[PDB]
Amino acid sequence: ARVTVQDAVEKIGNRFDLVLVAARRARQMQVGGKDPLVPEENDKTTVIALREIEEGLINNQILDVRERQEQQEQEAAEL
Amino acid sequence: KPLVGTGMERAVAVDSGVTAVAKRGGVVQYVDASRIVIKVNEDEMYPGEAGIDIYNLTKYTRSNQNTCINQMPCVSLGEPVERGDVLADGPSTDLGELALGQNMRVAFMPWNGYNFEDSILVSERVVQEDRFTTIHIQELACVSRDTKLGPEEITADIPNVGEAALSKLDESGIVYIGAEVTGGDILVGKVTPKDSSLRVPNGVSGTVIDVQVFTRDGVEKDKRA
Amino acid sequence: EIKELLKLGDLPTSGQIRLYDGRTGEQFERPVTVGYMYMLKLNHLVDDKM
Amino acid sequence: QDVVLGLYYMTRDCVNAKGEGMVLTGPKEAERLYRSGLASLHARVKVRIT
Amino acid sequence: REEAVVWDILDEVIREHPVLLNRAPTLHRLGIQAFEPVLIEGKAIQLHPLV
Amino acid sequence: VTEFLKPRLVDIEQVSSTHAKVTLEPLERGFGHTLGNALRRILLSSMPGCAVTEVEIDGVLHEYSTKEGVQEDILEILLNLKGLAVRVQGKDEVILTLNKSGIGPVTAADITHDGDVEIVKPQHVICHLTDENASISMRIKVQRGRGYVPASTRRLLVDACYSPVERIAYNVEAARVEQRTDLDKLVIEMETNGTIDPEEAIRRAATILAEQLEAFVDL
Amino acid sequence: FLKPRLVDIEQVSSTHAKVTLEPLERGFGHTLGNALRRILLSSMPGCAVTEVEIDGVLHEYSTKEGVQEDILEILLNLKGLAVRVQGKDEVILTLNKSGIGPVTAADITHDGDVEIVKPQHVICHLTDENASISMRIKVQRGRGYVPASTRIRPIGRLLVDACYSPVERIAYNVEAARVEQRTDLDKLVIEMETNGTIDPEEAIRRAATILAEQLEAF
């Protein structure tokens, strides 16, 4: 269920940073066990990443703050 | 034959040499799918060694571009043939007339874009009538090099391969003439001292029609040879 | 001469006849050219190139 | 090379048709007319569009 | 051996994995365009006439 | 030898009502266009329905005239009456009157009820009245018949859209069953005037075509 | 609404006929003509030669002593042969012939419930006093067109492309029917051209049954 990424580019207006952030998100989602924020409909991880981009509930800022928070909580979990 | 011809097609068909042009006129005494026999007219018979003449036709043999050359008879029994006229229809000819294709009922009109730029839209009836299907004889050679670590055999047993691919093979190692081989199957079983048997290439069907075996003077035989 | 030969049969002089759509089944709203052109088949087979 | 010809033959007018001076309330009835063959594709009508 | 299950699972990998259609003379930037594939029979690469 | 893959209505996923979209699959090779053409031409050319035939406006006498008090012209009045989607019962034809006055819009709900006469979308405007003395009235004669008839084939003549379907257009695209190579997937999109339901209009047309092929069927 | 019915079967020859349908309301003639033409051309069951087993021939691309035509040409001629086996859905025939002269299709020693519709269909020409052919022709019913290279054993079975299509050309005509008192009544004239192995009335009935079954989804 994907034809173009014009809305996603309208969200993050670089057309190149979009590819990097989507690649990072899909890499997080594929090899790891991170769950998608949008329910997938039997689609490849790239378009789930792009759909997360277009609804606006993700970006580079959200991803790196979430990763920093996850790193902080996992290093604090060692006690 | 082509409908809108030129009249030079006869010259090309009789000149190219595929058509068995009658050397001496006469009467067809015996026609057959592999030979044509003429009882020549008494005017053109020699005093001695006249007899009659026999034309040996060429059956399905490989051409230089893997197409099919095939001489077939175009005359009937007891048909008076003159001098310098065709007797055997060759490849892509028709009664001594160069017939390089087929006459098809065309219509110049756009059809839903299936003939968009230069494409051609063809009915199912065209292949139902069996018009453009073409024979393609191709050869596959499996040399047996007496390389290092020992000579290699043409034996009929191949390790680590079940009898499914060896069912078509005989007890000698060669495939039977007439087998309907499919892509990937074994034609001849060659194994080097320690599996390098020749196989049909991927995605090509066919039927084995001729196997010729050449052996060194010093290597005796196998039962198939 | 071509038109005379066409008139020898019962074919139109214009060379174009009327065909109906195979699927739709209605008239094509223009006469179209129909004839027998000698159509060769080249040995640039797709399975020799795929 | 096909779409341009189709559009140009469609978006064109000549002064005759099966129905010429009739009036339509929108594109849908124009399609209904053309599919049924009650009006040629090159009519000159006054439809009501939005 | 091209089993029936392989044909079923091919339709899974080919779903939204774009490929690069490319012509031999690539004069300009539009000589390489990415399309999603649609599996069909035959041995020919069907191409959208608009491009 | 007669085992044909029966089509099944997979989904009737539709836009807002009277704009249905039926996709039945899988048809055998080539029957998709056959069924699409049969259903399309039967729906668009022969369906029992009711539409207005002619109108008798008291204030005007010629199809190109002007009646004081309306802001439209006669042509747009006839064009509005063209789409008066009205469902009529057993009576073949009835006469409708549209007595109204006063400044404001003139919708279809301001018509004499006449009992069984029912309008499915009453918000259909007819004209706009912008004068105190603007008194409008018209005698509308809705008739029952089948198909579409031009006005130039048969007191102002109005094209009568008897068949409830407005836009019918099928579509055929390739579909595959588990192993077989080439089948069809008929996609039927239609939009009716509201006097009937498209999922019922399709089966009505199917019944009409089936009744033809019952005299020489093997049952 | 009126209903049509078969009124005449203009059997102008053995192969092609002219069936008439009457009456049809305005706009139904073209619908019925198109639907019946497409169903007849695409979906008429029939019978055709499928496999040939010549006794002394290994593969299609060989030659045989005595016959004037190659084995492939004989296969094409057998492909162009029509048959009307009555009861069984799959029959194996036998053809034996000797002596100089053409091998007519009438030489097939068919049993009771097998009928050859065009006996004069020549197969091959023997050109020898002592030369014979003995083939086991195979016939089965089918539908549409199934080539030899798309189905699914010995080295003697020659696979032959099959064309299960008794009809060859279906043209319909539409004109007004001279009813007692009514206008807009079409008279369909289906000028069909079979190859002799099917009754046109049965073909029309089968097409009607298939169309009705297709509509029976709703």
PDB file of N, CA, C and O in Angstrom, chain F residues 147-203:
ATOM      1  N   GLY F 147     -35.320   1.764 -20.596  1.00  0.00           N
ATOM      2  CA  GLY F 147     -34.231   2.307 -21.387  1.00  0.00           C
ATOM      3  C   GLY F 147     -34.139   3.821 -21.352  1.00  0.00           C
ATOM      4  O   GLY F 147     -34.645   4.495 -20.452  1.00  0.00           O
ATOM      5  N   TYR F 148     -33.451   4.358 -22.358  1.00  0.00           N
ATOM      6  CA  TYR F 148     -33.283   5.794 -22.537  1.00  0.00           C
ATOM      7  C   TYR F 148     -33.837   6.185 -23.899  1.00  0.00           C
ATOM      8  O   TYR F 148     -33.547   5.526 -24.902  1.00  0.00           O
ATOM      9  N   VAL F 149     -34.628   7.253 -23.932  1.00  0.00           N
ATOM     10  CA  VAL F 149     -35.183   7.759 -25.186  1.00  0.00           C
ATOM     11  C   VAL F 149     -34.844   9.240 -25.332  1.00  0.00           C
ATOM     12  O   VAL F 149     -35.002  10.016 -24.378  1.00  0.00           O
ATOM     13  N   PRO F 150     -34.328   9.665 -26.483  1.00  0.00           N
ATOM     14  CA  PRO F 150     -34.090  11.095 -26.704  1.00  0.00           C
ATOM     15  C   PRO F 150     -35.397  11.859 -26.855  1.00  0.00           C
ATOM     16  O   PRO F 150     -36.437  11.314 -27.230  1.00  0.00           O
ATOM     17  N   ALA F 151     -35.331  13.157 -26.546  1.00  0.00           N
ATOM     18  CA  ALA F 151     -36.502  14.015 -26.709  1.00  0.00           C
ATOM     19  C   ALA F 151     -36.823  14.239 -28.180  1.00  0.00           C
ATOM     20  O   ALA F 151     -37.985  14.461 -28.542  1.00  0.00           O
ATOM     21  N   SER F 152     -35.810  14.181 -29.045  1.00  0.00           N
ATOM     22  CA  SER F 152     -36.006  14.414 -30.470  1.00  0.00           C
ATOM     23  C   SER F 152     -36.499  13.155 -31.174  1.00  0.00           C
ATOM     24  O   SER F 152     -36.482  13.079 -32.407  1.00  0.00           O
ATOM     25  N   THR F 153     -36.934  12.161 -30.401  1.00  0.00           N
ATOM     26  CA  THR F 153     -37.501  10.941 -30.960  1.00  0.00           C
ATOM     27  C   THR F 153     -39.022  10.927 -30.876  1.00  0.00           C
ATOM     28  O   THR F 153     -39.689  10.455 -31.803  1.00  0.00           O
ATOM     29  N   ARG F 154     -39.585  11.445 -29.789  1.00  0.00           N
ATOM     30  CA  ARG F 154     -41.033  11.486 -29.628  1.00  0.00           C
ATOM     31  C   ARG F 154     -41.564  12.899 -29.845  1.00  0.00           C
ATOM     32  O   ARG F 154     -41.253  13.542 -30.848  1.00  0.00           O
ATOM     33  N   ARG F 155     -46.074  22.241 -22.279  1.00  0.00           N
ATOM     34  CA  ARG F 155     -45.778  21.098 -23.136  1.00  0.00           C
ATOM     35  C   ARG F 155     -44.360  21.189 -23.693  1.00  0.00           C
ATOM     36  O   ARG F 155     -44.153  21.646 -24.817  1.00  0.00           O
ATOM     37  N   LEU F 156     -43.388  20.753 -22.896  1.00  0.00           N
ATOM     38  CA  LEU F 156     -41.982  20.756 -23.279  1.00  0.00           C
ATOM     39  C   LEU F 156     -41.427  19.345 -23.147  1.00  0.00           C
ATOM     40  O   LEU F 156     -41.554  18.722 -22.087  1.00  0.00           O
ATOM     41  N   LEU F 157     -40.810  18.850 -24.217  1.00  0.00           N
ATOM     42  CA  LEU F 157     -40.267  17.498 -24.207  1.00  0.00           C
ATOM     43  C   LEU F 157     -38.999  17.440 -23.365  1.00  0.00           C
ATOM     44  O   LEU F 157     -38.108  18.282 -23.502  1.00  0.00           O
ATOM     45  N   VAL F 158     -38.924  16.440 -22.492  1.00  0.00           N
ATOM     46  CA  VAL F 158     -37.793  16.240 -21.598  1.00  0.00           C
ATOM     47  C   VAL F 158     -37.261  14.831 -21.812  1.00  0.00           C
ATOM     48  O   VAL F 158     -38.040  13.873 -21.890  1.00  0.00           O
ATOM     49  N   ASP F 159     -35.939  14.706 -21.931  1.00  0.00           N
ATOM     50  CA  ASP F 159     -35.330  13.384 -21.992  1.00  0.00           C
ATOM     51  C   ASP F 159     -35.638  12.612 -20.718  1.00  0.00           C
ATOM     52  O   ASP F 159     -35.481  13.124 -19.609  1.00  0.00           O
ATOM     53  N   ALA F 160     -36.076  11.377 -20.885  1.00  0.00           N
ATOM     54  CA  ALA F 160     -36.525  10.550 -19.773  1.00  0.00           C
ATOM     55  C   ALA F 160     -35.490   9.463 -19.499  1.00  0.00           C
ATOM     56  O   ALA F 160     -35.202   8.632 -20.367  1.00  0.00           O
ATOM     57  N   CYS F 161     -34.937   9.476 -18.289  1.00  0.00           N
ATOM     58  CA  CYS F 161     -33.921   8.514 -17.876  1.00  0.00           C
ATOM     59  C   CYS F 161     -34.574   7.403 -17.055  1.00  0.00           C
ATOM     60  O   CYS F 161     -34.538   7.391 -15.820  1.00  0.00           O
ATOM     61  N   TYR F 162     -35.200   6.463 -17.770  1.00  0.00           N
ATOM     62  CA  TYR F 162     -35.978   5.429 -17.095  1.00  0.00           C
ATOM     63  C   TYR F 162     -35.073   4.527 -16.268  1.00  0.00           C
ATOM     64  O   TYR F 162     -35.379   4.203 -15.115  1.00  0.00           O
ATOM     65  N   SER F 163     -33.953   4.114 -16.849  1.00  0.00           N
ATOM     66  CA  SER F 163     -33.057   3.184 -16.181  1.00  0.00           C
ATOM     67  C   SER F 163     -32.412   3.864 -14.978  1.00  0.00           C
ATOM     68  O   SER F 163     -31.825   4.945 -15.124  1.00  0.00           O
ATOM     69  N   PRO F 164     -32.512   3.282 -13.778  1.00  0.00           N
ATOM     70  CA  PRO F 164     -31.968   3.943 -12.583  1.00  0.00           C
ATOM     71  C   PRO F 164     -30.461   4.138 -12.608  1.00  0.00           C
ATOM     72  O   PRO F 164     -29.967   5.048 -11.931  1.00  0.00           O
ATOM     73  N   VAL F 165     -29.719   3.334 -13.367  1.00  0.00           N
ATOM     74  CA  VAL F 165     -28.267   3.459 -13.381  1.00  0.00           C
ATOM     75  C   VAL F 165     -27.858   4.688 -14.183  1.00  0.00           C
ATOM     76  O   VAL F 165     -28.394   4.958 -15.268  1.00  0.00           O
ATOM     77  N   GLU F 166     -26.921   5.461 -13.635  1.00  0.00           N
ATOM     78  CA  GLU F 166     -26.381   6.641 -14.300  1.00  0.00           C
ATOM     79  C   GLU F 166     -25.074   6.357 -15.020  1.00  0.00           C
ATOM     80  O   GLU F 166     -24.952   6.630 -16.217  1.00  0.00           O
ATOM     81  N   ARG F 167     -24.087   5.811 -14.313  1.00  0.00           N
ATOM     82  CA  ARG F 167     -22.794   5.458 -14.889  1.00  0.00           C
ATOM     83  C   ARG F 167     -22.523   3.992 -14.592  1.00  0.00           C
ATOM     84  O   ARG F 167     -22.417   3.602 -13.426  1.00  0.00           O
ATOM     85  N   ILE F 168     -22.418   3.181 -15.639  1.00  0.00           N
ATOM     86  CA  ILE F 168     -22.013   1.787 -15.521  1.00  0.00           C
ATOM     87  C   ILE F 168     -20.781   1.575 -16.391  1.00  0.00           C
ATOM     88  O   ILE F 168     -20.762   1.970 -17.563  1.00  0.00           O
ATOM     89  N   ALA F 169     -19.744   0.981 -15.806  1.00  0.00           N
ATOM     90  CA  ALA F 169     -18.490   0.764 -16.520  1.00  0.00           C
ATOM     91  C   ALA F 169     -17.765  -0.392 -15.847  1.00  0.00           C
ATOM     92  O   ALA F 169     -17.331  -0.264 -14.698  1.00  0.00           O
ATOM     93  N   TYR F 170     -17.638  -1.507 -16.557  1.00  0.00           N
ATOM     94  CA  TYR F 170     -16.955  -2.672 -16.025  1.00  0.00           C
ATOM     95  C   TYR F 170     -15.447  -2.523 -16.218  1.00  0.00           C
ATOM     96  O   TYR F 170     -14.961  -1.595 -16.871  1.00  0.00           O
ATOM     97  N   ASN F 171     -14.692  -3.452 -15.637  1.00  0.00           N
ATOM     98  CA  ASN F 171     -13.244  -3.457 -15.783  1.00  0.00           C
ATOM     99  C   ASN F 171     -12.753  -4.887 -15.633  1.00  0.00           C
ATOM    100  O   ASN F 171     -13.213  -5.609 -14.744  1.00  0.00           O
ATOM    101  N   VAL F 172     -11.829  -5.292 -16.499  1.00  0.00           N
ATOM    102  CA  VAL F 172     -11.274  -6.639 -16.491  1.00  0.00           C
ATOM    103  C   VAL F 172      -9.775  -6.540 -16.253  1.00  0.00           C
ATOM    104  O   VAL F 172      -9.065  -5.868 -17.009  1.00  0.00           O
ATOM    105  N   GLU F 173      -9.299  -7.208 -15.205  1.00  0.00           N
ATOM    106  CA  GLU F 173      -7.878  -7.275 -14.907  1.00  0.00           C
ATOM    107  C   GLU F 173      -7.520  -8.706 -14.538  1.00  0.00           C
ATOM    108  O   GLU F 173      -8.362  -9.469 -14.058  1.00  0.00           O
ATOM    109  N   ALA F 174      -6.260  -9.062 -14.775  1.00  0.00           N
ATOM    110  CA  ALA F 174      -5.826 -10.443 -14.622  1.00  0.00           C
ATOM    111  C   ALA F 174      -5.842 -10.875 -13.160  1.00  0.00           C
ATOM    112  O   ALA F 174      -5.409 -10.138 -12.270  1.00  0.00           O
ATOM    113  N   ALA F 175      -6.349 -12.082 -12.921  1.00  0.00           N
ATOM    114  CA  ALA F 175      -6.326 -12.703 -11.606  1.00  0.00           C
ATOM    115  C   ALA F 175      -5.884 -14.149 -11.761  1.00  0.00           C
ATOM    116  O   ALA F 175      -6.074 -14.762 -12.813  1.00  0.00           O
ATOM    117  N   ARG F 176      -5.289 -14.690 -10.702  1.00  0.00           N
ATOM    118  CA  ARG F 176      -4.756 -16.044 -10.715  1.00  0.00           C
ATOM    119  C   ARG F 176      -5.378 -16.863  -9.592  1.00  0.00           C
ATOM    120  O   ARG F 176      -5.498 -16.390  -8.457  1.00  0.00           O
ATOM    121  N   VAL F 177      -5.831 -18.069  -9.932  1.00  0.00           N
ATOM    122  CA  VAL F 177      -6.188 -19.073  -8.938  1.00  0.00           C
ATOM    123  C   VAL F 177      -4.875 -19.768  -8.596  1.00  0.00           C
ATOM    124  O   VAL F 177      -3.853 -19.513  -9.243  1.00  0.00           O
ATOM    125  N   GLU F 178      -4.887 -20.624  -7.572  1.00  0.00           N
ATOM    126  CA  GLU F 178      -3.708 -21.262  -6.991  1.00  0.00           C
ATOM    127  C   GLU F 178      -2.657 -21.756  -7.988  1.00  0.00           C
ATOM    128  O   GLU F 178      -1.459 -21.657  -7.704  1.00  0.00           O
ATOM    129  N   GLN F 179      -3.064 -22.287  -9.144  1.00  0.00           N
ATOM    130  CA  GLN F 179      -2.065 -22.768 -10.096  1.00  0.00           C
ATOM    131  C   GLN F 179      -2.265 -22.263 -11.521  1.00  0.00           C
ATOM    132  O   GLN F 179      -1.284 -22.054 -12.243  1.00  0.00           O
ATOM    133  N   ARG F 180      -3.514 -22.063 -11.942  1.00  0.00           N
ATOM    134  CA  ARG F 180      -3.780 -21.775 -13.347  1.00  0.00           C
ATOM    135  C   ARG F 180      -3.259 -20.394 -13.728  1.00  0.00           C
ATOM    136  O   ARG F 180      -3.217 -19.475 -12.906  1.00  0.00           O
ATOM    137  N   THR F 181      -2.858 -20.256 -14.993  1.00  0.00           N
ATOM    138  CA  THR F 181      -2.049 -19.114 -15.405  1.00  0.00           C
ATOM    139  C   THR F 181      -2.892 -17.855 -15.578  1.00  0.00           C
ATOM    140  O   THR F 181      -2.694 -16.859 -14.872  1.00  0.00           O
ATOM    141  N   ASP F 182      -3.835 -17.877 -16.517  1.00  0.00           N
ATOM    142  CA  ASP F 182      -4.538 -16.673 -16.951  1.00  0.00           C
ATOM    143  C   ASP F 182      -6.033 -16.852 -16.724  1.00  0.00           C
ATOM    144  O   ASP F 182      -6.673 -17.679 -17.382  1.00  0.00           O
ATOM    145  N   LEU F 183      -6.583 -16.070 -15.802  1.00  0.00           N
ATOM    146  CA  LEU F 183      -8.016 -15.960 -15.577  1.00  0.00           C
ATOM    147  C   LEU F 183      -8.415 -14.487 -15.654  1.00  0.00           C
ATOM    148  O   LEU F 183      -7.616 -13.623 -16.024  1.00  0.00           O
ATOM    149  N   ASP F 184      -9.663 -14.203 -15.298  1.00  0.00           N
ATOM    150  CA  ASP F 184     -10.197 -12.850 -15.335  1.00  0.00           C
ATOM    151  C   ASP F 184     -10.757 -12.468 -13.971  1.00  0.00           C
ATOM    152  O   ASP F 184     -11.163 -13.317 -13.174  1.00  0.00           O
ATOM    153  N   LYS F 185     -10.771 -11.160 -13.712  1.00  0.00           N
ATOM    154  CA  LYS F 185     -11.360 -10.615 -12.487  1.00  0.00           C
ATOM    155  C   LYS F 185     -12.237  -9.437 -12.910  1.00  0.00           C
ATOM    156  O   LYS F 185     -11.751  -8.318 -13.091  1.00  0.00           O
ATOM    157  N   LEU F 186     -13.525  -9.708 -13.084  1.00  0.00           N
ATOM    158  CA  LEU F 186     -14.455  -8.660 -13.476  1.00  0.00           C
ATOM    159  C   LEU F 186     -14.657  -7.678 -12.331  1.00  0.00           C
ATOM    160  O   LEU F 186     -14.944  -8.068 -11.198  1.00  0.00           O
ATOM    161  N   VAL F 187     -14.502  -6.393 -12.636  1.00  0.00           N
ATOM    162  CA  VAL F 187     -14.674  -5.317 -11.667  1.00  0.00           C
ATOM    163  C   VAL F 187     -15.792  -4.434 -12.205  1.00  0.00           C
ATOM    164  O   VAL F 187     -15.611  -3.737 -13.210  1.00  0.00           O
ATOM    165  N   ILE F 188     -16.946  -4.461 -11.547  1.00  0.00           N
ATOM    166  CA  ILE F 188     -18.123  -3.730 -11.998  1.00  0.00           C
ATOM    167  C   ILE F 188     -18.356  -2.558 -11.056  1.00  0.00           C
ATOM    168  O   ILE F 188     -18.641  -2.751  -9.868  1.00  0.00           O
ATOM    169  N   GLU F 189     -18.238  -1.347 -11.585  1.00  0.00           N
ATOM    170  CA  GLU F 189     -18.544  -0.126 -10.857  1.00  0.00           C
ATOM    171  C   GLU F 189     -19.780   0.531 -11.454  1.00  0.00           C
ATOM    172  O   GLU F 189     -19.909   0.653 -12.674  1.00  0.00           O
ATOM    173  N   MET F 190     -20.693   0.956 -10.584  1.00  0.00           N
ATOM    174  CA  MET F 190     -21.918   1.583 -11.056  1.00  0.00           C
ATOM    175  C   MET F 190     -22.386   2.633 -10.062  1.00  0.00           C
ATOM    176  O   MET F 190     -22.023   2.606  -8.884  1.00  0.00           O
ATOM    177  N   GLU F 191     -23.202   3.559 -10.561  1.00  0.00           N
ATOM    178  CA  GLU F 191     -23.805   4.608  -9.748  1.00  0.00           C
ATOM    179  C   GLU F 191     -25.222   4.817 -10.254  1.00  0.00           C
ATOM    180  O   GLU F 191     -25.419   5.166 -11.421  1.00  0.00           O
ATOM    181  N   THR F 192     -26.202   4.605  -9.383  1.00  0.00           N
ATOM    182  CA  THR F 192     -27.606   4.750  -9.739  1.00  0.00           C
ATOM    183  C   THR F 192     -28.183   6.034  -9.153  1.00  0.00           C
ATOM    184  O   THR F 192     -27.577   6.688  -8.302  1.00  0.00           O
ATOM    185  N   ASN F 193     -29.384   6.377  -9.611  1.00  0.00           N
ATOM    186  CA  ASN F 193     -30.015   7.641  -9.236  1.00  0.00           C
ATOM    187  C   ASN F 193     -30.602   7.633  -7.833  1.00  0.00           C
ATOM    188  O   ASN F 193     -31.096   8.682  -7.403  1.00  0.00           O
ATOM    189  N   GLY F 194     -30.574   6.517  -7.103  1.00  0.00           N
ATOM    190  CA  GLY F 194     -31.102   6.441  -5.763  1.00  0.00           C
ATOM    191  C   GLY F 194     -32.448   5.752  -5.660  1.00  0.00           C
ATOM    192  O   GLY F 194     -32.874   5.409  -4.551  1.00  0.00           O
ATOM    193  N   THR F 195     -33.125   5.541  -6.783  1.00  0.00           N
ATOM    194  CA  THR F 195     -34.407   4.841  -6.773  1.00  0.00           C
ATOM    195  C   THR F 195     -34.255   3.343  -6.611  1.00  0.00           C
ATOM    196  O   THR F 195     -35.267   2.648  -6.457  1.00  0.00           O
ATOM    197  N   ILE F 196     -33.029   2.829  -6.639  1.00  0.00           N
ATOM    198  CA  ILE F 196     -32.788   1.395  -6.532  1.00  0.00           C
ATOM    199  C   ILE F 196     -31.417   1.200  -5.906  1.00  0.00           C
ATOM    200  O   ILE F 196     -30.609   2.133  -5.856  1.00  0.00           O
ATOM    201  N   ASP F 197     -31.161  -0.004  -5.408  1.00  0.00           N
ATOM    202  CA  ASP F 197     -29.835  -0.250  -4.868  1.00  0.00           C
ATOM    203  C   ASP F 197     -28.974  -0.973  -5.898  1.00  0.00           C
ATOM    204  O   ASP F 197     -29.441  -1.908  -6.556  1.00  0.00           O
ATOM    205  N   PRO F 198     -27.721  -0.537  -6.074  1.00  0.00           N
ATOM    206  CA  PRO F 198     -26.869  -1.161  -7.107  1.00  0.00           C
ATOM    207  C   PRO F 198     -26.667  -2.657  -6.926  1.00  0.00           C
ATOM    208  O   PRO F 198     -26.652  -3.399  -7.919  1.00  0.00           O
ATOM    209  N   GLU F 199     -26.521  -3.129  -5.684  1.00  0.00           N
ATOM    210  CA  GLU F 199     -26.377  -4.564  -5.460  1.00  0.00           C
ATOM    211  C   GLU F 199     -27.651  -5.310  -5.830  1.00  0.00           C
ATOM    212  O   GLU F 199     -27.606  -6.506  -6.136  1.00  0.00           O
ATOM    213  N   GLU F 200     -28.792  -4.622  -5.808  1.00  0.00           N
ATOM    214  CA  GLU F 200     -30.038  -5.196  -6.295  1.00  0.00           C
ATOM    215  C   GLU F 200     -30.246  -4.934  -7.780  1.00  0.00           C
ATOM    216  O   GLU F 200     -30.877  -5.748  -8.461  1.00  0.00           O
ATOM    217  N   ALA F 201     -29.717  -3.824  -8.301  1.00  0.00           N
ATOM    218  CA  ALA F 201     -29.827  -3.553  -9.732  1.00  0.00           C
ATOM    219  C   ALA F 201     -29.049  -4.576 -10.550  1.00  0.00           C
ATOM    220  O   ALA F 201     -29.505  -5.007 -11.618  1.00  0.00           O
ATOM    221  N   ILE F 202     -27.868  -4.972 -10.067  1.00  0.00           N
ATOM    222  CA  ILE F 202     -27.060  -5.953 -10.789  1.00  0.00           C
ATOM    223  C   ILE F 202     -27.792  -7.286 -10.877  1.00  0.00           C
ATOM    224  O   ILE F 202     -27.859  -7.907 -11.944  1.00  0.00           O
ATOM    225  N   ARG F 203     -28.372  -7.739  -9.763  1.00  0.00           N
ATOM    226  CA  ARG F 203     -29.104  -8.997  -9.799  1.00  0.00           C
ATOM    227  C   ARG F 203     -30.426  -8.870 -10.546  1.00  0.00           C
ATOM    228  O   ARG F 203     -30.898  -9.861 -11.108  1.00  0.00           O
TER     229      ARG F 203
END
